[PDB]
Design an enzyme around this catalytic site. Structure first.
Site, short mmCIF file in Angstrom:
data_model
loop_
_atom_site.label_atom_id
_atom_site.label_comp_id
_atom_site.label_asym_id
_atom_site.label_seq_id
_atom_site.Cartn_x
_atom_site.Cartn_y
_atom_site.Cartn_z
N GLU A 35 1.36 -10.81 8.13
CA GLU A 35 2.65 -10.37 7.61
C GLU A 35 3.61 -11.57 7.53
O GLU A 35 4.27 -11.72 6.57
CB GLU A 35 3.27 -9.28 8.52
N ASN A 46 10.75 -6.55 -2.15
CA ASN A 46 9.80 -5.71 -2.87
C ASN A 46 10.30 -5.30 -4.20
O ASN A 46 11.50 -5.31 -4.45
CB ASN A 46 9.48 -4.49 -2.06
N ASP A 48 10.63 -2.39 -5.41
CA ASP A 48 11.49 -1.23 -5.28
C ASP A 48 12.90 -1.56 -4.79
O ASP A 48 13.74 -0.66 -4.68
CB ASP A 48 10.81 -0.14 -4.44
N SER A 50 13.61 -2.79 -1.86
CA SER A 50 13.67 -2.82 -0.41
C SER A 50 13.29 -4.26 0.05
O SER A 50 12.82 -5.08 -0.74
CB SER A 50 12.78 -1.79 0.26
N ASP A 52 11.37 -6.57 3.39
CA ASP A 52 10.65 -6.63 4.63
C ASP A 52 11.18 -7.75 5.52
O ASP A 52 11.43 -8.88 5.05
CB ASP A 52 9.15 -6.95 4.36
N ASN A 59 10.25 -2.76 7.01
CA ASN A 59 10.80 -2.53 5.69
C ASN A 59 12.05 -1.64 5.74
O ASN A 59 12.16 -0.73 6.58
CB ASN A 59 9.73 -1.91 4.78
N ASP A 101 4.23 7.06 13.78
CA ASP A 101 4.73 7.97 12.75
C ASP A 101 3.65 8.82 12.10
O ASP A 101 3.98 9.81 11.40
CB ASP A 101 5.46 7.22 11.66
#
Ligand SMILES: [Cl-]
Ligand SMILES: [Cl-]
Ligand SMILES: [Cl-]
Ligand SMILES: [Cl-]
Ligand SMILES: [Cl-]
Ligand SMILES: [Cl-]
Ligand SMILES: [Cl-]
Ligand SMILES: [Pt+2]
EC number: 3.2.1.17
Length: 129
Positions: A35, A46, A48, A50, A52, A59, A101
Site C-alpha cells: 500500500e 482515486n 471517485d 476519494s 487514500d 480511504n 467490517d
C-alpha cells in the site's frame, strides 16, 4: 516517516495488530509494504475523488474526514491527516475497525492481490519481535 520492515512490524505489535481478527503480523507488514512502501506520508487520489492515506492507505469514502469527498462518512472519527503521522496509532485503530467490517483484509485490494495466500511470514523473518 519511512519505516524499516522490522521497525514497523515492532510498532504494529506494540499497538495490538499482531493476530488481530486472526491476521498474523506478516499479513499487516505485507499490506503496508504494497500500500505505502512503509511511508506514513503516502497519499493516493482515486478516480471517485476519494483519497487514500497513510501506511495502510485508508480511504476517505468511509473511514476518515478530509472535507473533499462528497457523500463520505468518517467511521474512524479522525481527520484523514492523522493517518499520515509518524505515530501509527491512528492508522492501527482505524485498520482494526476496517478489518472488522465483514471482509477481513480483503478491504485492502493490494493485500488481496499481492499478499493473500503468499508466504507472508517472510515479512517478519529475522525481526526481533
Ligand atoms: Cl522491505
Ligand atoms: Cl506472519
Ligand atoms: Cl466528520
Ligand atoms: Cl468530505
Ligand atoms: Cl476532521
Ligand atoms: Cl508508532
Ligand atoms: Cl477473516
Ligand atoms: Pt503508542
Amino acid at each position: 516517516k519511512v519505516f524499516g520492515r522490522c521497525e514497523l512490524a515492532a510498532a504494529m505489535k506494540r499497538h495490538g495488530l499482531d493476530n488481530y481478527r486472526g491476521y498474523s503480523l506478516g499479513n499487516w507488514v505485507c499490506a503496508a509494504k504494497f500500500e505505502s512502501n512503509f511511508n506514513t506520508q503516502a497519499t493516493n487520489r482515486n478516480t471517485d475523488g476519494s483519497t487514500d492515506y497513510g501506511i495502510l492507505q485508508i480511504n476517505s469514502r468511509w473511514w476518515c474526514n478530509d472535507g473533499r469527498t462528497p457523500g463520505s462518512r468518517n467511521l474512524c472519527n479522525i481527520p484523514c491527516s492523522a493517518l499520515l503521522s509518524s505515530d501509527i496509532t491512528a492508522s492501527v485503530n482505524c485498520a482494526k475497525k476496517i478489518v472488522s467490517d465483514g471482509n477481513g483484509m480483503n478491504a485492502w485490494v493490494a493485500w488481496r492481490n499481492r499478499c493473500k495466500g503468499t508466504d507472508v511470514q517472510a515479512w517478519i523473518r529475522g525481526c526481533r519481535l
